[PDB]
């Protein structure tokens, strides 16, 4: 156990960049739906 | 003040999708730098 810990922090950053991207999309759907609904009345 | 509150929640979702996207990139830089550094030794 010398440089094995790096693989740990690496796996976390992976699920963080992928999980972060998905989270942004969600917020993009709410802002896109609320912005498109505001155009109509 | 009937349908003005919508513009508020809308502005927030905007800075949330843009701020969220930027946050993902950051995590992508740390995972890309840690993954590229692991390939070398």
| Number of domains within chain B | 1
Using the structure block, give the residue that is written with the tokens 């840690």.
B34
Check: CB of residue B15 under 8 Å from CB of residue A18: no
For residue A17, the tally of other CB atoms under 10 A from its CB is 20
Check: CB of residue B36 under 8 Å from CB of residue A13: no
3-state secondary structure of B7: helix
For residue A14, the tally of other CB atoms under 10 A from its CB is 16
What's the angle, vertex CA B12, arms to CA A15 and CA B19, rounded to 5? 35
| Burial status of residue A22 (CB atoms within 10 A of its CB: 0-12, 13-18, 19 or more) | exposed
| Binding-site residues on chain B for chain A (CB distance < 8 A) | 6-7, 9-10, 13-14, 16-17, 20-21, 23-24, 27-28, 30-31, 34-35, 38
Technique used to solve these coordinates: NMR
CATH code of the domain covering residue A26 = 1.20.5.500
- B7 lies in which domain range? 1-41
Using the structure block, give the residue that is written with the tokens 């960049």.
A17
């Amino acid at each position: 156990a010398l440089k094995k810990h790096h693989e740990n922090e690496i796996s976390h950053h992976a699920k963080e960049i992928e999980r972060l991207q998905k989270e942004i999309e969600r917020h993009k759907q709410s802002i896109k739906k609320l912005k498109q609904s505001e155009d109509d009345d």
